[PDB]
Amino acid sequence: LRNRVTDRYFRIQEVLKHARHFRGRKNRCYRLAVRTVIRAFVKCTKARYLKKKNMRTLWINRITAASQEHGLKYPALIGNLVKCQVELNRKVLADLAIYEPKTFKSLAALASRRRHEGFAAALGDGKEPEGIFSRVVQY
Amino acid sequence: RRPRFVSLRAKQNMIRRLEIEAENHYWLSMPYMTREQERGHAAVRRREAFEAIKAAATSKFPPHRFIADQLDHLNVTKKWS
Amino acid sequence: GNRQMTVIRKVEGDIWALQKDVEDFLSPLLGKTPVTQVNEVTGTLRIKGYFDQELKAWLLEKGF
Amino acid sequence: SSFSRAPQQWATFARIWYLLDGKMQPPGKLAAMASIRLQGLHKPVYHALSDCGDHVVIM
Amino acid sequence: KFTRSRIPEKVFQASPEDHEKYGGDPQNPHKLHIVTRIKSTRRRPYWEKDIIKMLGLEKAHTPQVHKNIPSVNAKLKVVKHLIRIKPLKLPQGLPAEENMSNTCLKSTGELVVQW
Amino acid sequence: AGGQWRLQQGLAANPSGYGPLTELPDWSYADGRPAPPMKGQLRRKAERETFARRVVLLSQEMDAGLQAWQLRQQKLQEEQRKQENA
Amino acid sequence: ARALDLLRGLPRVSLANLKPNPGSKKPERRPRGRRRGRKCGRGHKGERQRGTRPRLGF
RNA sequence: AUCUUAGUUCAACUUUAAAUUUGCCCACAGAACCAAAUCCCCUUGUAAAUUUAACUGUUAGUCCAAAGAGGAACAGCUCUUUGGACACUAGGAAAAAACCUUGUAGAGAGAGUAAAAAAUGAUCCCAAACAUAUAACUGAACUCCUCACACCCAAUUGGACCAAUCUA
RNA sequence: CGCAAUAGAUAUAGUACCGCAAGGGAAAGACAAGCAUAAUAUAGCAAGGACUAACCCCUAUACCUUCUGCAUAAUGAAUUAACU
Ligand SMILES: [Mg+2]
Ligand SMILES: [Mg+2]
Ligand SMILES: [Mg+2]
Ligand SMILES: [Mg+2]
Ligand SMILES: [Mg+2]
Ligand SMILES: [Mg+2]
Ligand SMILES: [Mg+2]
Ligand SMILES: [Mg+2]
Ligand SMILES: [Mg+2]
């Protein structure tokens, strides 16, 4: 024997250290620890996309709940806050709904106002003066 | 099973694309020049660009070598005293 | 089989001066500055293209 | 609102008993409302792992 | 078989009804096309992948400018279903050697100076 | 999400497109002096600059082509008059 | 000269400092890893891989 | 082509290094007497192509659209041709290699979109429901945003690093 | 710039043992897996996102090799250490 790996121990522990918290024989037997650790890291990588998707769907749910508390669906709130040129995103809308109820009450009132302005305008004949909140501000 | 039941959303998506491409049809039935007018107006730029490509392709060669780089490798034993 | 080159080999002293001189001397002939390599360690100047006779004459004129 | 810690925490996550009549109502609509309320999907503070569900009483 | 498509010229003939439907004019046409890609080159024949690679339209929407001359239209008539063409509008004229670094392209297709 | 409405009002479909949100300086110093601009703004200025230079270059080439055609029409339609004498 | 002046302010030359001229000692290739060796370059099954293909010119 | 179809050699395709200048797209013109399109080039959009030196590897694949020949114009049938996809990423149609959407790659607890919902025989039915509150919203690794970038194919090929041991 | 007790000779030995026989032919000496301390609690390639919180929620069709891709279609692996 001319050359023999003298440090296989550390190469094993580099992979077992990530498996101490697993369950079964696959937290101390390398042949199984490797496969499950690799699956673990692949899921760890692939899960960030789902993290973003899930937080966004949670925010949409919370905003739907808050907006329904004020007699106003979620399509209306977002599709008529932007028509008032307020670029509040959904994370901060959810935070406002939970932690600042009256500010969210005002935002819902603003959305309902703009919705009514839109309905009144479209109901009319022609280009009668625009609604007091429906006036765009240009850059 | 094999047949499908084309929805309304799909119809609306297809009509959106159809309208975009009809606008494309319109913006292509009026060219600024004609076949004969355009001929040659870009020749100078094309020739110069291809000459740039040629001069790039015909410049490959090994990089220089300096004595300083070779002697710098003696620094791998620099000591305090 | 297609890369032609010439080498001026036993160059001693500042090889960069010789590089500038050779570039000046050859640039009119080729219709462009000739690509070159300088190996300041071995002391050689390598030049793309075949210019052996021209360079021999030129190094004769300057008295080498 | 300046409530202490524990009282605030209790106030926010508390359970609320919602009555819901059903006379001449279709089962599906009552089911939709009951599903939303039982799950906790009417609370801006909702989450799946927080057990914010409420009580529903359909008579 | 499946083959390249030669579009009859009859389609590329603006009518008196089309002209007032888009902001155009038969006389005094428009210099430059602003073109964007709104569809994938994948799942389409190679003689469209190459055209798109040639017009600089490799990336997605990312608008790009081209001349309005038939030598380029012949290329855009092959990829007309993977692109949106709009006419560039210059209501302030070509910029000078000053105002090159302070331009902006609005969504309506107008190039303007200093936002 | 009102991209349809935003494009119907001459705005960018994407609020993170061009607007006060994306290109105004996100911060200044406390005293008031401005901050070294952000990388994204530099890159967008460079790309818009290249777009403008390409626009002017193509337009110039097309106009010069029209003028060249005019010159050729002159020197082929009129130089035939030089054969209408003697 | 010029280089001989450089050597004066560098450390002493010894067998701890030498080096090969760059570009001379091309690195070696061994079939280990996911690139060099999974089939080690010999291809799919077939007499090419086993090292039993006919004589040169057959 | 092969006592050959479980394989080999040549070609085609792939890779590296090197030389040079045209390569691709392409209107008008042009290609026979007995329908789709194809060939060929001026320009134009492009930046690639040919040549040389040196090696390995793959080779008679599946599905879908189309035109044919064989079996009905069927038997999910053998074969030829044009194209696409797969054997590479991701999202949809329920699960889903082959349909639709989408590619060049990292971090974000930001944003805009793409495709995408049905109408009126044999163990155990199979999401639950809903006729009428204004059409928009939801929806990706596509795109934008702040920062960073060599950091998502098999066979093969090129390159940058390197664990441990011996010797100077 | 030879090995150092699975290497180096097969070797502590051509002994023990196998074969009627020719013949074959060993082993070894100086906190790895497995368990206990401490059995388990709806749910499911046994993980990931996480979370105040271990489970509960959402996502998620094992690995190698061979066939055009293979839900495991088939072949191989109880597991550790050494040698390959
Ligand atoms: Mg999204
Ligand atoms: Mg070797
Ligand atoms: Mg031609
Ligand atoms: Mg991208
Ligand atoms: Mg021994
Ligand atoms: Mg032995
Ligand atoms: Mg142990
Ligand atoms: Mg099974
Ligand atoms: Mg078995």
From Swiss-Prot, chain A:
Gene3D superfamilies registered for this protein in UniProt: Ribosomal protein L20
Compartments, as annotated in UniProt: Mitochondrion
GO cellular component, one term: mitochondrial ribosome
Major subcellular site: mitochondrion
InterPro entries (alphabetical): Ribosomal_bL20, Ribosomal_protein_bL20_C
GO molecular function, one term: rRNA binding
Keyword terms: Mitochondrion, Ribonucleoprotein, Ribosomal protein, Transit peptide
SUPFAM superfamilies linked: Ribosomal protein L20
Cross-referenced CDD domains: Ribosomal_L20
Listed Pfam families: Ribosomal_L20
Example GO BP: mitochondrial translation
Family listed: Belongs to the bacterial ribosomal protein bL20 family.
Subunit structure: Component of the mitochondrial large ribosomal subunit (mt-LSU). Mature mammalian 55S mitochondrial ribosomes consist of a small (28S) and a large (39S) subunit. The 28S small subunit contains a 12S ribosomal RNA (12S mt-rRNA) and 30 different proteins. The 39S large subunit contains a 16S rRNA (16S mt-rRNA), a copy of mitochondrial valine transfer RNA (mt-tRNA(Val)), which plays an integral structural role, and 52 different proteins. Interacts with OXA1L.
Record-given protein name: Large ribosomal subunit protein bL20m
Lineage of origin: Eukaryota, Metazoa, Chordata, Craniata, Vertebrata
Gene: MRPL20
From Swiss-Prot, chain B:
Protein origin, superkingdom: Eukaryota
Main location as per UniProt: mitochondrion
Any one annotated GO CC term: mitochondrion
Protein's cellular compartments: Mitochondrion
BP term (GO), one: mitochondrial translation
Example of a GO MF term: structural constituent of ribosome
Keyword Kinase carried by entry: no
Keywords: Mitochondrion, Ribonucleoprotein, Ribosomal protein
Signal peptide: none
Quaternary organization: Component of the mitochondrial large ribosomal subunit (mt-LSU). Mature mammalian 55S mitochondrial ribosomes consist of a small (28S) and a large (39S) subunit. The 28S small subunit contains a 12S ribosomal RNA (12S mt-rRNA) and 30 different proteins. The 39S large subunit contains a 16S rRNA (16S mt-rRNA), a copy of mitochondrial valine transfer RNA (mt-tRNA(Val)), which plays an integral structural role, and 52 different proteins.
Family: Belongs to the mitochondrion-specific ribosomal protein mL63 family.
Protein name: Large ribosomal subunit protein mL63
Natural source organism: Homo sapiens (Human)
Gene, per the UniProt record: MRPL57
Shown segment, full-protein numbering: 22 to 102 of 102
UniProtKB/Swiss-Prot annotation, chain C:
Tissues/organs with expression: Ubiquitous.
Highest taxon of the lineage: Eukaryota
Keywords: Mitochondrion, Ribonucleoprotein, Ribosomal protein
Keyword Mitochondrion: yes
GO BP field: mitochondrial translation
A GO molecular-function descriptor: structural constituent of ribosome
Cellular-component GO terms for this entry: mitochondrial inner membrane; mitochondrial large ribosomal subunit; mitochondrial ribosome; mitochondrion
The protein's assembly and partners: Component of the mitochondrial large ribosomal subunit (mt-LSU). Mature mammalian 55S mitochondrial ribosomes consist of a small (28S) and a large (39S) subunit. The 28S small subunit contains a 12S ribosomal RNA (12S mt-rRNA) and 30 different proteins. The 39S large subunit contains a 16S rRNA (16S mt-rRNA), a copy of mitochondrial valine transfer RNA (mt-tRNA(Val)), which plays an integral structural role, and 52 different proteins. Interacts with OXA1L.
Protein name: Large ribosomal subunit protein mL49
Organism from which the protein derives: Homo sapiens
Lineage: Eukaryota, Metazoa, Chordata, Craniata, Vertebrata
Designated gene of the protein: MRPL49
Residues shown, of full length: 103 to 166 of 166
Swiss-Prot record, chain E:
GO MF terms held by the record: structural constituent of ribosome
Localization in the cell: Mitochondrion
GO terms of biological process kind: mitochondrial translation
GO cellular component: mitochondrial inner membrane; mitochondrial large ribosomal subunit; mitochondrion
Keyword tags: Mitochondrion, Ribonucleoprotein, Ribosomal protein, Transit peptide
Disulfide bridge positions per record: none
Predominant localisation class: mitochondrion
Subunit organization: Component of the mitochondrial large ribosomal subunit (mt-LSU). Mature mammalian 55S mitochondrial ribosomes consist of a small (28S) and a large (39S) subunit. The 28S small subunit contains a 12S ribosomal RNA (12S mt-rRNA) and 30 different proteins. The 39S large subunit contains a 16S rRNA (16S mt-rRNA), a copy of mitochondrial valine transfer RNA (mt-tRNA(Val)), which plays an integral structural role, and 52 different proteins.
Protein family: Belongs to the universal ribosomal protein uL30 family.
Protein name in UniProt: Large ribosomal subunit protein uL30m
Organism: Homo sapiens (Human)
